Amino acid sequence: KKISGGSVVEMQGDEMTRIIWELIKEKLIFPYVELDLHSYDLGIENRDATNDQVTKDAAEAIKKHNVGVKCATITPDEKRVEEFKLKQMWKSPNGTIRNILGGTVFREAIICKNIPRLVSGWVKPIIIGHHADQYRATDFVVPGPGKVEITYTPSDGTQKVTYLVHNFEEGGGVAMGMYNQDKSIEDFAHSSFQMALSKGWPLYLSTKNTILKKYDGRFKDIFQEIYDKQYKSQFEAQKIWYEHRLIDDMVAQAMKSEGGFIWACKNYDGDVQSDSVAQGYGSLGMMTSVLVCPDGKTVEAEAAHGTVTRHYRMYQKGQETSTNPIASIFAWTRGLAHRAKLDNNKELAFFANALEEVSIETIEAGFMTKDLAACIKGLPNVQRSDYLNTFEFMDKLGENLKIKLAQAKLS
């Protein structure tokens, strides 16, 4: 008998991650779990043939079913449009899914004891939620002298208000306007509080409300009042807390820490690709994300990395690859964990736990892909004997998962 897993939305993607994804299904999920599988094919070719309709259906299906697990997908640029002979430059599937579901993206690196962290003392997870404000900035060029003003015009016909941004008296420059709605800050707080409670770690919000007393102040105030009104009691009953920190203070305290907290980052750039610390552990192969909706009901899980084109080109040319499947595995285990939580499914919750722990324990036992060996050894000194290829590593996790599940049949 396999475990009854229930309703899961699954999105197939592109290139190397598509390959790894099928291995995870074939070798780690399907042998143990029976799913009411809502599979959508978000490969670039299927997205093109359906005029991106598959991406919309998949999003609507997560809304309906509450648990999405997504493979990484090609976001087409002009070079991909030539490669695939695409009908048009299809928007990022991630963009499409985000704006339908709403939510806050939380990223977390998976800790192995034998894999050096940026701070050696980091042994508990650090979980970063970003809002999105560069993404809704209206920026322009100031060609020469003149006034830049930002104005608020009430919908109710009361007096417009005007604020001077700058009087350019000599020469030009550059100017932009940025906003946040109360509604989005409330969603971000709720997603942020829901996560801390569910992982049982404390929550920090970092801002620069010393400089931006109004803009960042609003984030501090909404978080604080939603905490007091709605979450304080639950937090104290898990012996955790919420606290606001100035960014300077948060960074300082985080580098002194052991980890084990949620960090809500009111920030200009929330991209993984521009975050040194995300990029200064193992690979993006050890970075997982979850989109958490404010309801605390609906979750979408993916690897924080891309389709690993470089490795895929090697795999088409027949050459040996060593691609880290951990972030992709943890998309599955976080989705199934959330499935298990919604359905009070003790067996699926155990299984999801077992697969996370077999993943960490396999790497901790010395069995790893090249990227992780390069972290221990330095890339110049890595030998073939220090690591496993993609298929060798997936077979080793399969071996260990079988053994841990056989042993667990004593409870």
Ligand X SMILES: NC(=O)c1ccc[n+]([C@@H]2O[C@H](COP(=O)([O-])OP(=O)(O)OC[C@H]3O[C@@H](n4cnc5c(N)ncnc54)[C@H](OP(=O)(O)O)[C@@H]3O)[C@@H](O)[C@H]2O)c1
Ligand Y SMILES: Cc1nc(NCc2cc3cc(Cl)ccc3[nH]c2=O)ccc1C#N
List residues near ligand X by CB under 6 A: 72-75, 94, 283-285, 302, 305-310, 323-324, 327, 371
Query: Does residue 277 bind a second copy (CB under 8 A)?
Result: yes
Instruction: Give the dihedral sign, CA 135/295/209/276.
Output: negative
Q: Choose the one of a second copy, ligand X, ligand Y, none that binds residue 74, judging by a C-beta under 5 to 8 angstroms depending on kind.
A: ligand X
d(CA 316, CA 310): 10
387-411 burial: b if 16+ Cβ within 10 Å, else e: bbebbebbebbbebbeeebeeeeee
CA 66 to chain centroid, in Å, comes to 16
Q: Choose the one of ligand Y, a second copy, ligand X, none that binds residue 26, judging by a C-beta under 5 to 8 angstroms depending on kind.
A: none
| Residue 287 near residue 279, CB atoms below 8 Å | no
Q: Choose the one of ligand Y, a second copy, ligand X, none that binds residue 323, judging by a C-beta under 5 to 8 angstroms depending on kind.
A: ligand X
Which one, 131 or 199, has the nearer CB to a second copy? Answer: 131
| Residue 60 near residue 31, CB atoms below 8 Å | no
d(CA 329, CA 313): 22
d(CA 14, CA 313): 12
**Contact letters for a second copy, residues 185-224 (x by CB under 8 A):** x----------------------x--xxxxxxxxx-----
Question: What DSSP state is assigned to residue 309?
Answer: H
**Binder to a second copy among 26, 182, 228, 258 (CB under 8 A)?**
182
**Contact letters for ligand Y, residues 236-255 (x by CB under 6 A):** ---------------x--xx
**Binder to ligand Y among 155, 159, 181, 276 (CB under 6 A)?**
276
Q: Choose the one of ligand Y, a second copy, ligand X, none that binds residue 55, judging by a C-beta under 5 to 8 angstroms depending on kind.
A: none
Structure tokens at 282: 């193992």
Contacting residues for 365 by C-beta, under 8 A, at least 6 apart: none
Which one, 8 or 105, has the nearer CB to ligand X? Answer: 105
Beta bridge partners, 287, equal 109
Q: Choose the one of ligand X, a second copy, ligand Y, none that binds residue 307, judging by a C-beta under 5 to 8 angstroms depending on kind.
A: ligand X
Q: Choose the one of ligand X, a second copy, ligand Y, none that binds residue 153, judging by a C-beta under 5 to 8 angstroms depending on kind.
A: a second copy
**Binder to ligand Y among 37, 132, 246, 277 (CB under 6 A)?**
277
Beta bridge partners, 139, equal 176
d(CA 303, CA 371): 16
Strand order in the sheet with 126-130: 33-41, 3-12, 67-70, 299-303, 287-292, 104-109, 126-130, 261-265, 203-207, 242-246
| Residue 127 near residue 257, CB atoms below 8 Å | no
| Residue 106 near residue 300, CB atoms below 8 Å | no
d(CA 262, CA 273): 20
Query: Does residue 107 bind ligand Y (CB under 6 A)?
Result: yes
**Binder to ligand Y among 10, 14, 15, 275 (CB under 6 A)?**
275
Q: CB of 261: closest distance to ligand Y in angstroms?
A: 10
d(CA 130, CA 20): 28
Q: Choose the one of ligand Y, ligand X, a second copy, none that binds residue 149, judging by a C-beta under 5 to 8 angstroms depending on kind.
A: a second copy
Query: Does residue 306 bind ligand Y (CB under 6 A)?
Result: no
Q: CB of 46: closest distance to a second copy in angstroms?
A: 25
Q: How many CA atoms lie within 13 A of 314 on its CB side?
A: 14
Query: Does residue 259 bind ligand Y (CB under 6 A)?
Result: yes
| Residue 282 near residue 375, CB atoms below 8 Å | yes
**Binder to a second copy among 81, 100, 247, 405 (CB under 8 A)?**
247
Q: CB of 376: closest distance to a second copy in angstroms?
A: 11
Question: Which residues within the stretch 359-398 sit at the binding site for a second copy (CB under 8 A)?
Answer: 378-379
Question: Which residues within the stretch 100-159 sit at the binding site for a second copy (CB under 8 A)?
Answer: 118-121, 133-156
Query: Does residue 118 bind ligand Y (CB under 6 A)?
Result: yes
**Contact letters for ligand Y, residues 203-242 (x by CB under 6 A):** ----------------------------------------
Q: CB of 85: closest distance to a second copy in angstroms?
A: 24
| Residue 6 near residue 339, CB atoms below 8 Å | yes
Q: Give the interface with ligand Y as residue ranges (CB under 6 A).
A: 107-109, 111, 117-118, 122, 125-126, 128, 251, 254-255, 259, 275-278, 281
